[PDB]
Design a binder for this molecule. Structure first.
Ligand SMILES: *[C@@H]1O[C@H](CO)[C@@H](O)[C@H](O)[C@H]1NC(C)=O
Lengths: 439, 52, 49
């Protein structure tokens, strides 16, 4: 048949399922997803690389005074300082002292750091639901990797399949996200051309090869004192000297749902929430008839000892009588019980065991074998161990959890006062009729 | 403190660790007395304690 | 797995215990005390020769 089902998008848990083909042994099959890999939409906004102040060699206007020509430079600064006096070994480089002025000009540009040291302010929206799943189809571990969309079904070895697409379209990412080569940060940046002087990303450019450099360094050139033949000036704060300290934890630790990080490109990893539809058609060559199945009689199952652990702390014993030799589809019909074994070779009047658990103490349950219902009881126990280093499988339950003798206790307490309400009813009718006995 | 979800802990350059509790197991009995608060202290303690 | 027993303090009598993990077939093991030697801590007060 074709069979379509939806598994909960849960990383690292074996999903067993029945594929009913009536008139045939129902193809119970096990498949388990491995990767949940999202990739948001590719849209670079701008770059932030480490600038440098470019102070060109200034102009000592000896015995004269000039003007202040303005060039189109980011954070341009120029000033004709009067009263200057140059020093060298010979002292006065200019001839006199008084009339010597000096032009001072500086600005900021990019550095050679920007070929590798930069950070992309980046726009991120809806992602690509890519994933990987391994199906143990009939002793055959076949693992595939594709994107969950709805149309791109891929087919290998009698098995077509389209995973997904993802229902719960939650992403860890938002629109504003800044990225450096080892670390991503879903933070708001100022937009391009909007950097406040001295801020995070105060120097702004589009690419590492854009010649446009939006810069903001609030710079101002102060006056040299005397003979200090240089450019004393203010401070141009780099954001990159504090591009590390504000980071804190990165988004490998801010993500919920166990979601992790892959760089270049940035894939969200194994972020288990929601559910994924898979739909697989296999034709009848994988389906064995019920009359071609060895029919089991004597469905006498029991358990030596069960324990509602995390792992398969129950293992039950099936004594049985098949008709002949051949495979048998063994299956847990109820989600409370998870058999870890797909199909077993059955011979006839023989006995074997089955590995499973639930999370409750008294599991009473009907297994399905060669399309055959079998009831079996199981007293499980609270397991001795306490820390578990792995999530469990069968423990996905609710509150209506059956018990050993609190069934009998709740039967004991519902056999309480309602009988006295029946007594109350007989007292009520006997006091009614005697009041009606007057007339 | 480990929640019912489980807890990640990372320490230094080495890879983090992911942890899951059990059902608050081994506080258990049935008995000729009640011992059903025992079974409750298995069966999700301190939530739906109010129902009994 | 874990198996805590309280055997009686008996020199030279064996003890059979039913060791069994939850899920597998049981086993009976023998342990035995051989000696309980109580060493008192001492201090010489004085001697006499
Ligand atoms: C198939 O993969 C499972 C895990 O998915 C592994 O435990 C098992 O040993 C594998 N069996 C074969 C036959 O490859």
């Amino acid at each position: 048949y074709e069979h379509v089902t939806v598994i909960p998008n849960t990383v690292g848990v074996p999903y067993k399922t029945l594929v009913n083909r009536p008139g045939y042994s129902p193809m119970v099959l096990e498949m388990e997803l491995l990767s949940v890999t999202l990739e948001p939409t590719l849209s670079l906004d701008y770059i932030t690389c480490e600038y440098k102040t470019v102070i060109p060699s200034p102009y000592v206007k000896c015995c004269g005074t000039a003007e202040c020509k303005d060039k189109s430079l980011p954070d341009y600064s120029c000033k004709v300082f009067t009263g200057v006096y140059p020093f060298m070994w010979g002292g006065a480089y200019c001839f006199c002292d008084t009339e010597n002025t000096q032009l001072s000009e500086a600005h900021v540009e990019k550095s050679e750091s920007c070929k590798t040291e930069f950070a992309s302010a980046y726009r991120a929206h809806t992602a690509s639901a890519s994933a990987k799943l391994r199906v143990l189809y009939q002793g055959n571990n076949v693992t595939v990797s594709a994107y969950a969309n709805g149309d791109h079904a891929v087919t290998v070895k009698d098995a077509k399949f389209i995973v997904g697409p993802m229902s719960s379209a939650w992403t860890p990412f938002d629109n504003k996200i800044v990225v450096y080569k080892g670390d991503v940060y879903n933070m708001d940046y100022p937009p391009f051309g909007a950097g406040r002087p001295g801020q995070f990303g105060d120097i702004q450019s589009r690419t590492p090869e854009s010649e446009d450099v939006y810069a903001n360094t609030q710079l101002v050139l102060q006056r040299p004192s005397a003979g200090t033949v240089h450019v004393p000036y203010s401070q141009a704060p780099s954001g990159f000297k504090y591009w590390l300290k504000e980071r804190g934890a990165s988004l490998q630790h801010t993500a919920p749902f166990g979601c992790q990080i892959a760089t270049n490109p940035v894939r969200a990893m194994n972020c288990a929430v929601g559910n994924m539809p898979i739909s697989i058609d296999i034709p009848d060559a994988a389906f064995t008839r019920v009359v071609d199945a060895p029919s089991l009689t004597d469905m006498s199952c029991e358990v030596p000892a069960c324990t509602h652990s995390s792992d398969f702390g129950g293992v039950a014993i099936i004594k049985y009588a098949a008709s002949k030799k051949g495979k048998c589809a063994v299956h847990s019909m109820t989600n409370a019980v998870t058999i870890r074994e797909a199909e077993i070779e059955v011979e006839g009047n023989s006995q074997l065991q089955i590995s499973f658990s639930t999370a409750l103490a008294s599991a009473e349950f009907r297994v399905q074998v060669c399309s055959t219902q079998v009831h079996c009881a199981a007293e499980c126990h609270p397991p001795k161990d306490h820390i578990v280093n792995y999530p469990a499988s069968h423990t996905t339950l609710g509150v209506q959890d059956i018990s050993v003798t609190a069934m009998s206790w709740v039967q004991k307490i519902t056999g309480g006062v309602g009988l006295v309400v029946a007594v109350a009813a007989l007292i009520l009718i006997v006091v009614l009729c005697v009041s009606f006995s007057r007339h | 403190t480990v929640p019912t979800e489980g807890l990640e802990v990372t320490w230094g350059n080495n890879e983090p660790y992911k942890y899951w509790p059990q059902l608050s197991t081994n506080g258990t009995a049935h008995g000729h007395p009640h011992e059903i608060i025992l079974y409750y202290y298995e069966l999700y303690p301190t939530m739906t304690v109010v129902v009994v």
